Design a protein around this ligand. Structure first.
Ligand SMILES: O=C(O)COc1c2cc(S(=O)(=O)O)cc1Cc1cc(S(=O)(=O)O)cc(c1OCC(=O)O)Cc1cc(S(=O)(=O)O)cc(c1OCC(=O)O)Cc1cc(S(=O)(=O)O)cc(c1OCC(=O)O)C2
Ligand SMILES: O=C(O)COc1c2cc(S(=O)(=O)O)cc1Cc1cc(S(=O)(=O)O)cc(c1OCC(=O)O)Cc1cc(S(=O)(=O)O)cc(c1OCC(=O)O)Cc1cc(S(=O)(=O)O)cc(c1OCC(=O)O)C2
Ligand code: HEC
Ligand code: HEC
Ligand code: NA
Lengths: 107, 107
């Protein structure tokens, strides 16, 4: 259950928990993970130029703040077979802050 | 203006005229030019993870078989300021064959 949080705290969390694998800006490069520009409102496995697992593509989830909060809690449970090596953001406050930043940064 | 041609001949033309800068398959990499999967029915300058010119983004053309054929005839004339260093496919039969292949390969 998503609730708007602190984009400032979320930016700091993104720099330590996500930035190593993902960029957010339009035209930002794909790295270990896909560039996340426009992720909200895009179906999973649809960023062109990125080699996804069939698991991520087949899940075909339409990304929204609410299902992304469920996904980021435990990625392997959400998408069994995903190659995103991320254990999960277990604190609701952290997910709210990170997703608030992500929505602003990927717009 | 587009008329269905030979996808077999189009595949060979893609190899000699496009492949040096582009891939077509789902998950294929961005190179000098963006990966072209899902190009038809998408607006120009929208493949994630690729850094386009402002010219290509501003053009905001919804790609279809006809405007693709005009574009490929003379890219710099259709999108002034584009960084696609391609003189153009001047032959109608070559554009028809290539687009017939692209319609299949990018979908
Ligand atoms: O227990 C649990 O079920 C939950 O564990 C946590 C997770 C997320 C958060 S949280 O978002 O609220 O913060 C907090 C904890 C609890 C915890 C807190 C801290 S600490 O107090 O903050 O120092 C340090 C460690 C922690 O785990 C204690 C333990 O394991 O007993 C020990 C550690 C440190 C580091 S490391 O420093 O980043 O390299 C990495 C891992 C760690 O786990 C080692 C282990 O597995 O063996 C692996 C791991 C990575 C990630 S990431 O990929 O999403 O980053 C998320 C989780 C991870 O655990 C996977 C797993 O549990 O299966 C899930
Ligand atoms: O056969 C027909 O009845 C009529 O075919 C044409 C001719 C002249 C003109 S035209 O002057 O108005 O242009 C236009 C066409 C129709 C056509 C147009 C275009 S296109 O839309 O304009 O691109 C492309 C091709 C064309 O032929 C479609 C097809 O073959 O089914 C495919 C092609 C491309 C090229 S290429 O320019 O070197 O790349 C070369 C040839 C091609 O044809 C063979 C193939 O591909 O195997 C060989 C050929 C050369 C010459 S030249 O040396 O005397 O000029 C004249 C003709 C030729 O074809 C002879 C042959 O068939 O027997 C006759
Ligand atoms: C590298 C070790 C990563 C870290 C750290 C995080 N992500 Fe990731 N992510 C990574 C990969 C390799 C993939 C593709 C997975 C696949 O199975 O193909 C992803 C994917 C995502 C997605 C889905 C993107 C899509 O287009 O469907 C999202 C929404 C995502 N990652 C978000 C994300 C965030 C917010 C992270 C920090 C909290 C994060 N990822 C860390 C690799 C890595
Ligand atoms: C390198 C020398 C290229 C060759 C050869 C071809 N293309 Fe290209 N293409 C290239 C670049 C650098 C760009 C981006 C242009 C920009 O101004 O940002 C492109 C772009 C395209 C596009 C538009 C893609 C979009 O998402 O809007 C298309 C449809 C395209 N290119 C098609 C294409 C084909 C079919 C070619 C062979 C005939 C071809 N390109 C060659 C670089 C290069
Ligand atoms: Na742990």
């Amino acid at each position: 259950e998503f609730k708007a949080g602190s984009a400032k705290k979320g930016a700091t969390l993104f720099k330590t928990r996500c930035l190593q694998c993902h960029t957010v800006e339009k035209g930002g490069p794909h790295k270990v993970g896909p560039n996340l520009h426009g992720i909200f409102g895009r179906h999973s496995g649809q960023a062109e130029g990125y080699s996804y697992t069939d698991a991520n593509i087949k899940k075909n989830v339409l990304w929204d703040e609410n299902n992304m909060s469920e996904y980021l809690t435990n990625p392997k449970k959400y998408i069994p077979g995903t190659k995103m090596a991320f254990g999960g953001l277990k604190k609701e406050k952290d997910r709210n802050d990170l997703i608030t930043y992500l929505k602003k940064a990927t717009e």
